[PDB]
Structure formats: C-alpha cells, structure tokens
Write a protein that binds this ligand. Structure first.
Ligand code: FAD
Ligand code: HEM
Ligand code: CBE
Ligand code: TEO
Ligand code: SF4
Ligand code: F3S
Ligand code: FES
Ligand code: NA
Lengths: 121, 588, 105, 238
C-alpha cells in the first residue's frame, strides 16, 4: 500500500495555522476544565467548611499553576473564538495579511489576559 | 493476442482543445469513445494559450465571416485551402457561442456581449481598416477554454485514460489504422486500444527547437506515429515563430499586447513596424513581424542586456488599469521570467518558435489523407487528425493569431459530427493480427532492452541546436543542406540510444526517450521539407530563393515516409459560398 | 446538518461570552472574598439562572466541538462512539451537577 | 556555486519505504534558475528521478511540490528563494496524498472532490439568449479570482481538514470551484448546489486555518470564497 508524505516536522505552518491548532487544543482543555471548576465550585458552596477548604486548595502553589493554565487556555479560546466570529460576520477581512495581523493581535491580547489571570490568582 | 485489448468505436489520442471537443461530440453522437492523454487533460498546451479565439462574432464592431476568410487566406500566403478556411470562418461564430453556453468565462463588453480585441492580420472590408475580432478571457483564454471543455467532459462522463502514452498506430494487412498501442504511465502496463476510428489530436512539436514557447510535452508524437505508419505529413517546413517570446526565456507574451495598443521599439526608440508594414504596423502577419525584428537585430539596431539581443515591447502607456484587467497573465510572466514590470518598462522580446502549420493532411471531416502511386488523394481508412497535429490546411504558410483555438473547436467538433458517415464510408475493417500489434511495439522493445548505448540527453540537445541554427526564421540552402546531414548522423546515434531507468511505476525517463524518437522524426521531416521548398512563402524564408514563386510552389509540400522523399499537393481554391481569393502580392 | 451546527456553536459562544464578562466583572470588583459575599452572589436568582443557562450552552457548544475533534482524529468507529458516549455523559452530568449545586444554595 | 538537495525517493519495486537522497548540482554564480530547471538537470545525472512537469511557466499546475516545507510550483520557484547557506534544499511530494513514485502523487482524491461539486455550467434553458448569454462586466468581475485555478492541489494538500477527511471535506480548491459556479450569473441551479453543500463536512470542515491562501501560486483566496459559500448557506438554510 502506498506511502504518503504526512510528516508534520517537515512542513511549514504559517502563524494562522498555529493560531488555529491552539484554538482547538484550548477548547479541549477547557472542556476538561469545566468539570474541575464545577468540582471546585461545588466544594466552595456546600458549607462554611467547604469554603475554607476550597481556599486551602487554592493556596497551594501547584494548584495556582494549574488554575492559571486553565484561565489562560480559556482566555485564548475566547479571544481567538471572537476573532473567528469577526471573520464569519465580516468585521475582519479573510485575506492572508489580515489573518496574520489579527492572529498576532490575538496573541498579544491573550498574553495580557494571562497576566491579569496570574494576578487574580 | 498476448496484450490486453480495450475496444471502443473511437480512440482519441490527445486531450487538448481539439481532442476534448472531438471526444465530447463523438460521445454525444452515441459512439463509445476513449480519450487518451499523456498528462492530466487540463495540463495540455492549450491551457497556456493567451490572446483569444479569432471569430466573426460581430460584437466589438459589425463584422463578416468573409472578411475573416480573406484575412486568413491572405495571412496563409495563399497556400491555405480555401474550401477549408471557408468552412472554419463561416462555422466559427456558432461553434464559439456554444463554448460560451458551456460556461466559458469570456470577458465582456458593456452591453454584456463577448469582448473581442484587435489582433495580427485583422481587417474590415477585405484588407481595409484594423478589425477587432479575437474573443478573449483576459489573456488566459486557453486556460478558460480547456478547463471549460474538461468540465463538459466530466458532465458527459467521457471515458478518459489520463497519463497514458500512445506508442504507435496499429495497421491491419489492408493498410488500415485499427487503433494504437499505449503505455499506462502509472503502472507500466502496455495495451492495445482497438478502434474503428483513431483520432490523432496530439498537438505541436516546438520542442524540436532550442527555444520555444511550447510546453515540455510538445514533442510531435503524432508526427512520429504517422510517419512510422507510412502516413505522410504536409508543409512541415512551415513553422511559426511568434514575434514576441520573452528574450532569454522563450515564454510567450501575447500578441494581445499589441492588440491592446502596445508596440515594438528598437534601440533608437523607433517604432520600426511603421516602416516594415505601413498599414497594419505591429499587427501585420507574424511571419513579417518576426522577420522585421530579426532584421533590426541583425543590422545592429536591436537592444541587449542580461536578456540577450531583443526588441522592446512597450505597454506602459496603456496604464495600470488596462494592463491588470486585459493582460494580467503577461504581467505575471514578464515579472517572473524577465524581471521586468510591464507597467513601468518595456518587455524584452524576440521571435521564438511557436506553432506547427504542418502535419497530417486531412479532410474537413478530419479523415487523414495519403497519396497513391499516381499522386491522387486517398483516405487512410480508420485514421483521423484534428488540431495542431492536422494540416487541413486552414493556416497555409502562416497562421493568424487566434485561428488555432478556432480550428481546435471547429474541426474537433466536425470530426465528431462526421464520424458515423466516415466509419460507414470506410466500411468494416479487418482485424489486426497479433504480429500487427507486435510491430507497434518494436520501438518500445528497443528502448527497454538497450542498456549500453548512447545518452539520449546529448542527442536531444544536438537535435535542438541543429534546428535552431539551420531552420530558424532565416534559412539558406547551404546551411540547410548541412543541417540535414547532421540530422542523419544524429538520427543514427538515436537508433543505439540507451534507457537508463527500466522500472515500471511512473517511469518518466522511458516516456522522454520515446518522445525523443518523435522529435527526431519531426525534425527530420521538417528539414527535408525546408530544403525541398525553393522559394520564400509566409514563415519559410530563404536567402537563395527570396521570392514567392506561384508558378512552381503555389502548393503544399508532402513528405513521403517510405521513400523519405518529397512531392507536391494541390492547394484548394474552390470555396462553395463565394468566389476564390486570387493569389496576389502580400504586404501589410 | 452543518448549517445547524455552525449557528449553534456561535449562538452559544455569544451567551458564554456574556456569562464570562458577568463572572469576571464580579471577581474583579469584590475585594476580599468572604464566604458571605461569595454565597450572596451565587444565591442571587440572576446568578443561578445565568449559570444554568451557561451550563446548557456548554452542553451544546462543547458537544459540537468535541464531535468535530473526534471526527477528525479518531477513525475506528467503536472507539469513537465510546468516546462520544463518555463526553455527552460528562456534559449532561455537568448540567445536572450544576442544578444540584445551585438549587442547594 | 554548489547547490545541495535532499529529495524524496520512492519506487515500490525497489524500496521498502520512502527515503531522502542527497544530490549536488554545480550552478552558474551569475544566474538564478528555477527549481524545475534544477530538477531537470538532476535527472540528466539520475535518469530514475521522476516528477511531473509541462508548461514550465506556472500555468499548467503539473509540478506542485513541498519545498523547504512549503507547497508551490517548481517552475516559478527561484533557487535563490530556497537556497540557504549550510542547509539542504528539501524537496518532497505534496502532503497527504498517496505517493505513486518519487515526487509524483496520486491526485485521485483531489479530482474526486472537484467532480463532487459539479463543476460545470448548469443552466435550465429558460429564457435562452439570442446569441451568447449576456453577462455585464460587473457580473463577470465576480469570477475573477475563481476561474484562474490551475488545479495544482497546493492548497488542498496543505489543509489539515483535507488531510483528515479527504473524502468528505471538499477542500479549498474544490470549494473555490463551487463558488465559481455559485456566483456565475449564467448558472441557474444555485439553490440545488447549496442544498448539496449543507452537510457537516463538505464546506464546514473549513476552520480558517488559512494554509490555502498562503500557498496558492496564482494568488487566489479559497478562504474568502469559502466564507461567501457559508453566508449563502445561512441565507438559504437558517
Ligand atoms: C504555445 C502557445 C500556443 C498558443 C498560445 C499560447 C502559447 C504559450 N495562445 C494562443 C491563442 O491565444 N490563440 C490561438 O488561437 N492559439 C494559441 N496558441 C496555439 C494553440 O494554443 C495550440 O496550437 C493549441 O492549443 C493546440 O491544441 P491541440 O488540442 O491541438 O493540442 P494540445 O493542447 O497541445 O494537446 C495535445 C494533447 O495530446 C496529448 N498527447 C501528445 N502526445 C501523446 C501521446 N504520445 N500519447 C497520449 N497523448 C498524447 C497531450 O497529453 C495533450 O493532451
Ligand atoms: C466555556 C466553555 C467552552 C468550551 C468547553 C469550548 C469548547 C470548544 C471546542 C471543543 C470547540 C471545537 C474546536 C475545534 O473544532 O477546533 C470549540 C469551538 C469554538 N469555540 Fe468554544 N468552548 C467554550 C467557550 C467558548 C467561548 C466563550 C467562545 C467565544 C467566542 C468560544 C468560541 C468558539 C468558536 C467560534 C468555535 C468554533 C471554531 C471552528 O468551528 O473552527 N467558545 N469550543
Ligand atoms: C483540522 C483542524 C485543525 C488541525 O488539525 N490543525 C492542524 C493539525 C496538525 C498540524 C497542523 C495543523 S486545528 C483547527 C480545527 O481544524
Ligand atoms: O499571441 C497570442 O496570444 C497567441 O500566441 C495567439 C495565437 O493564436 O498563437
Ligand atoms: S486555488 Fe490555487 S493552490 Fe489551489 S489548486 Fe487552485 S491554483 Fe492551485
Ligand atoms: S487551509 Fe483549510 S481550513 Fe479552510 S481556510 Fe483553508 S481550506
Ligand atoms: S510546469 Fe506547468 S505549472 Fe509548473
Ligand atoms: Na498543424
């Protein structure tokens, strides 16, 4: 049966494709994260003691890191999701130049939101 | 039969404009039809055609098919067959309108009609004012045409054998063509396509020259196939050199550049075509323009640079808007291949081998002709040809721009409309024996078994160099005689040439070696024919016989492959719908 | 069909964006997070309703999205159907657990 | 000046699996050739090296290749655009399709997706024109950017959605062709065509990855064409 060239290390991906695969990954991560946030929210709401315990969980440095990652993936998924919708509705042009430009601005905005997420934590 | 046999009513060898239009027609007439092509169909050279289709639509100004007929006859320098030119010009408008109904994306006038531009050799009123009759899709008309025809073939479910290489015609013991052997490039499989009608539609052969506008695949396969089957070819000395190939690259820039208002300059900034063709100027016949450029260069008035000697094609005065809308493809080609932006600077150009006026003589029905021992025309039963491989002849000694695409469509369609009658007229054909099929494999078995002979690459290069030095725009008896001797030697080397790749899965070397045989036959026929024609007419121009000679040479030249010798064939001068155009001195 | 998925993903994206703005709004303007203010926020009818509406939006949005991912990278049918089952079940559990958490506050 | 290449080789009667083979070519210092020129010369020295080509002027679409990681046409890719000091010029087949031999891929799936969108004029024959269909320059402008496609597959073989579902996602080139008939004012079957493009896969597997636009050797923009199809699908089915 015939071989195919699909060796991903040998192929150039422009920034728009990087933006794009990260949007997919951030969506999957966020899917799992929702469960974790709900488990955490449930605990923080079950009683006064459930609440102190959620704070103690959030006090942990390892947990701060995870929670920061979750918020970053979320921010990324939201920002680049909005970018997607702006193209769909004609607010952003669908040219390669515009795609590059809007991807970059999307990364900058995400970095800012990821720093604000660090602070909030 | 030790080879697989695939049987159809018709086998069409070639899927350019002519072959695809023919297959479509043959199929719609109820006959089974196999369309073969050595590349995927939309990669045929037609796909590179630029300027458009010359046809009396009467859109840009009131027109008349007889004006077009006149331009064509005069353009051909009086050896175009006038009954055939009449059929083409009169049939043209409806045949082209049918492409538009198939969805061809023609450019448009303001009132929504098909856009037509001026082109070389176009006049109103039988030699009057410049006409504009070349229908265009910007300057990618060949692309638009071929893709549309392919689309129609998908729609029609035509049986297409893509990337099959036809090797040689198969003849039966009565001398009738009964199909061809072919090689499947993907698998290496060899097959006999058996047919009642075998239609050559294999295109031209510009690759016999060192510099050509033609695709790498333009190797004259149908000329070699005809010749090896004992079928003659006609007017092979008549090679069109397009006046404006890019200098140093060979890549064409369309005559639509001059049609839209561009013109040629020499190193003094003289618009020299005003001198050489006071009426039509830069829109004179191509043989005349091409010679005029070479005369400027020869006499020290050409330009030079990184590109080599050349004339300048100035377009900038048309403006960015007209250039990007009417001529976008030549913007790309000039930038890429000349490193010159036509919006700002003139394109360096030189005459470059472009089109084969010669080929397999045919009737308007597409049936191939041979001659008997008495020199009379007789149909070759089972064989047809359409398109640049055919010599109907509607182009004579110099083809008009835009008239080849018209030819592909008019004659591809005609072969298919007439196929049932042609098959009925020729009668039932005897079957090929196995030895008949075997004879069609001899050439292939030679290559498959020769490991130790000569390098095909040097042979191809020598052949190209010979044609370029000796059978170019200006010819001379002594040089041509020597050229011919050199080709005989090269042709002998070719009989001992080696195949270095013996593999079977997409082996392109084998295909290129088989093509080399067809370049050799085409070059050889061309050289014998050019030596033979002792006069100058249209594209054929000789220092030792500088004059047109209507008494001896108002006729076709015919190369007889069994004796490797020449004879002459009558030119038709009996149109049905109007009177003949008498031969006269031809100036632009 | 495809038009239906495309619209639903985008309709729910808009609802979740509003919900995120609402939630972030709260977080970034509430100083010390006492148990008291935390529970007062989630006891509000507005917060309860919005959170359940977000949860339904997630069920819809993430289902389409995860289906898109699985139909790209997981070819063996049985494995794929199994993964879809786990994923739908998880999303439905998210909603139901959400109902249990807020109706308990 | 010496040019160094690493080129993908595969012959099923000889190789167990594909390999890269190194080649050297002496070039003229003062001249910049196209990659196709270089390949043609490598084949003079290794007759077994197989690749497609024809027009050598960027119009026929024969010679799509992955060059230093990026799809394009060998015939209009200057060597100076590929040649980096101390690195090999890497030539590989278009990604995602079966490799027949060396640099030649089986384009079968690419053509099948093209046929699926019925790329030919559909006109119901009512109100026939007297001669040609009349199409104003403004209507004809809509085909610019769509009818120029040379079917080279550089775009589709660079699209991840096309890699994962080459038999259900139409792919950028095919959708560009669909849009070409969708907005042709002489095509009367617009609604039928949109009805055939409403499933989850034909059009909607496009995620605006934009690999298609970045590689098109003719400067076309499938992403935008695809956007317009999605709008027409909403307009008709939402
Ligand atoms: C070179 C050129 C010519 C040209 C032009 C621009 C260029 C760069 N612009 C033109 C224009 O604007 N108007 C016009 O009237 N003519 C123009 N020309 C000339 C014209 O394009 C050509 O003469 C014409 O397109 C020839 O078409 P035709 O159908 O006769 O043949 P083809 O397109 O060259 O296709 C040949 C087919 O045959 C197949 N083939 C060849 N050999 C074999 C074998 N051995 N076995 C199987 N198939 C074979 C090829 O695969 C191809 O499909
Ligand atoms: C909060 C929980 C969310 C989860 C779990 C989630 C999950 C997902 C997943 C798994 C995908 C599929 C990714 C793909 O196929 O490439 C997706 C797609 C998408 N998401 Fe979300 N998402 C969430 C919220 C949001 C928000 C707030 C936005 C704001 C715009 C958003 C915008 C989008 C868009 C536009 C797509 C479709 C992109 C495409 O089809 O190419 N998502 N989401
Ligand atoms: C098919 C698809 C993605 C994809 O698979 N991207 C990708 C994968 C591997 C390598 C490069 C890009 S990311 C955006 C959603 O659609
Ligand atoms: O100049 C052209 O566009 C082209 O070369 C036309 C013919 O007919 O050959
Ligand atoms: S859209 Fe561009 S890259 Fe894709 S097939 Fe057409 S010409 Fe090639
Ligand atoms: S690269 Fe693929 S996802 Fe869409 S924008 Fe392009 S077709
Ligand atoms: S060889 Fe025709 S596009 Fe490169
Ligand atoms: Na001819």
């Amino acid at each position: 049966q015939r071989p195919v060239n699909l060796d991903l290390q040998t192929i150039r991906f422009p920034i728009t494709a990087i933006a794009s695969i990260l949007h997919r990954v951030s969506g999957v991560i966020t899917f799992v994260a929702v469960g974790i946030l709900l488990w955490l929210l449930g605990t923080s709401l079950s009683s006064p003691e459930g609440f102190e315990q959620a704070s103690a969980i959030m006090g942990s440095f390892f947990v701060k890191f995870i929670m920061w990652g979750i918020l970053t993936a979320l921010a990324y998924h939201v920002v680049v999701g909005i970018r997607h919708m702006m193209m769909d509705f004609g607010y952003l042009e669908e040219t390669f130049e515009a795609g590059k430009r809007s991807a970059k601005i999307s990364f900058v905005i995400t970095v800012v939101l990821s720093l604000l997420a660090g602070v909030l934590v | 039969m030790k080879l697989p046999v695939r049987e159809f009513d018709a086998v069409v060898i070639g899927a350019g404009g002519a072959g695809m239009r023919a297959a479509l027609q043959i199929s719609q007439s109820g006959q089974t039809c196999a369309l073969l092509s050595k590349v995927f169909p939309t990669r045929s050279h037609t796909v590179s055609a630029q300027g458009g289709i010359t046809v009396a639509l009467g859109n840009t100004h009131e027109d008349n098919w007889e004006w077009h007929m006149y331009d064509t006859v005069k353009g051909s320098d009086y050896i175009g067959d006038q009954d055939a030119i009449e059929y083409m010009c009169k049939t043209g408008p409806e045949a082209i309108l049918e492409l538009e109904h198939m969805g061809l994306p023609f450019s448009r006038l303001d009132d929504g009609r098909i856009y037509q531009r001026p082109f070389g050799g176009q006049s109103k009123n039988f030699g009057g004012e410049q006409a504009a009759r070349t229908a265009a899709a910007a300057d990618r008309t060949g692309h638009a045409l071929l893709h549309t025809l392919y689309q129609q073939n998908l729609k029609n479910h035509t049986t297409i054998f893509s990337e099959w290489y036809a090797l040689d015609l198969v003849k039966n013991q009565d001398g009738a063509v009964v199909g061809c052997t072919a090689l499947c490039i993907e698998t290496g499989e060899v097959v006999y396509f058996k047919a009642r009608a075998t239609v050559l539609a294999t295109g031209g052969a510009g690759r016999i020259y060192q510099s050509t506008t033609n695709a790498h695949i333009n190797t004259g396969d149908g000329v070699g196939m005809a010749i090896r089957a004992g079928v003659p070819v006609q007017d092979m000395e008549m090679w069109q050199f397009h006046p404006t190939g890019i200098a140093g690259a060979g890549v064409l820039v369309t005559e639509g550049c001059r049609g839209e208002g561009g013109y040629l300059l020499n190193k003094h900034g003289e618009r020299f075509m005003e001198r050489y063709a006071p009426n039509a100027k830069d829109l004179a016949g191509r043989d005349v323009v091409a010679r005029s450029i070479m005369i400027e260069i020869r006499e020290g008035r050409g330009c030079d640079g990184p590109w080599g000697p050349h004339a300048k094609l100035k377009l900038d005065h048309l403006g960015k808007e007209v250039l990007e809308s009417r001529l976008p493809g030549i913007l790309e080609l000039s930038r890429t291949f000349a490193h010159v932006d036509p919006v700002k600077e003139p394109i360096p150009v030189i005459p470059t081998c472009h089109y084969m006026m010669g080929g397999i003589p045919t009737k308007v029905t597409g049936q191939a002709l041979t001659v008997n021992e008495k020199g009379e025309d007789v149909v070759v039963p089972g064989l047809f040809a359409v398109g640049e491989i055919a010599c109907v002849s509607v182009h004579g000694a110099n083809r008009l721009g835009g008239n080849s695409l018209l030819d592909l469509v008019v004659f591809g369609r005609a072969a298919g409309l007439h196929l049932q009658e042609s098959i009925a007229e020729q009668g039932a054909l005897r079957d090929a024996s196995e030895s008949d099929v075997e004879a069609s494999l001899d050439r292939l078995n030679r290559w498959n078994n020769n490991r130790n002979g000569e390098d095909p690459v040097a042979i191809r290069k020598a052949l190209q160099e010979c044609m370029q030095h000796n059978f170019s725009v200006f010819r001379e008896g002594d040089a041509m005689a020597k050229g011919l001797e050199q080709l005989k030697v090269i042709r002998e080397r070719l009989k001992n040439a080696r195949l270095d790749d013996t593999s079977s899965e997409f082996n392109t070397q084998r295909v290129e070696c088989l093509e080399l045989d067809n370049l050799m036959e085409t070059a050889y026929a061309t050289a014998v024919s050019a030596n033979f024609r002792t006069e100058s007419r249209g594209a054929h121009s000789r220092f030792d016989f500088p004059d047109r000679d209507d008494e001896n040479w108002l006729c076709h030249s015919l190369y007889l492959p069994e004796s490797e010798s020449m004879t002459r064939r009558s030119v038709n001068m009996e149109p049905k719908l109007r009177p003949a155009f008498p031969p006269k001195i031809r100036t632009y | 069909n495809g038009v239906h998925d495309f619209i639903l993903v985008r309709a729910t994206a808009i609802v979740l964006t509003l919900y995120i703005i609402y939630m972030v709004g709260f977080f970034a303007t509430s100083g010390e997070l006492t148990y008291e203010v935390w529970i007062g926020f989630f006891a509000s009818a507005f917060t309860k309703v919005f959170t359940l509406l977000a949860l339904f939006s997630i069920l819809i949005h993430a289902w389409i999205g995860m289906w898109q991912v699985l139909t790209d990278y997981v070819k063996p049918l049985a494995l794929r159907l199994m993964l879809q089952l786990v994923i739908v079940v998880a999303l439905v559990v998210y909603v139901i657990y959400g109902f249990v958490v807020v109706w308990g506050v | 000046m010496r040019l160094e290449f690493s080129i993908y080789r595969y012959n099923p009667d000889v190789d167990d699996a594909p390999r890269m083979q190194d080649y050297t070519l002496e070039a003229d210092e003062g001249r910049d050739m196209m990659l196709l020129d270089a390949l043609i010369q490598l084949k003079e020295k290794d007759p077994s090296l197989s690749f497609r080509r024809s027009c050598r002027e960027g119009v026929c679409g024969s010679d799509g290749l992955n060059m230093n990681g990026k799809n394009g046409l060998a015939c209009i890719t200057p060597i100076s655009a590929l040649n980096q000091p101390g690195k090999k010029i890497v030539i590989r087949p278009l990604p995602g399709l079966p490799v027949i031999r060396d640099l030649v891929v089986d384009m079968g799936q690419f053509y099948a997706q093209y046929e699926k969108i019925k790329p030919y004029l559909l006109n119901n024959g009512q109100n026939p024109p007297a001669r040609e269909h009349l199409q104003m320059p403004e209507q004809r402008e809509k085909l610019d950017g769509l009818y120029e496609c040379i079917l080279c597959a550089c775009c589709s073989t660079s699209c991840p959605s096309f890699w994962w579902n080459p038999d259900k996602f139409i792919g950028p080139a095919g959708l560009l062709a669909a849009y070409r008939f969708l907005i042709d004012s002489r095509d009367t079957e617009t609604d039928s065509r949109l009805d055939g493009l409403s499933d989850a896969f034909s059009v909607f597997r496009c995620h605006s990855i934009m690999n298609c636009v970045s590689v098109c050797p003719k400067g076309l923009n499938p992403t935008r064409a695809i956007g317009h199809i999605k709008s027409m699908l909403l307009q008709r089915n939402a």
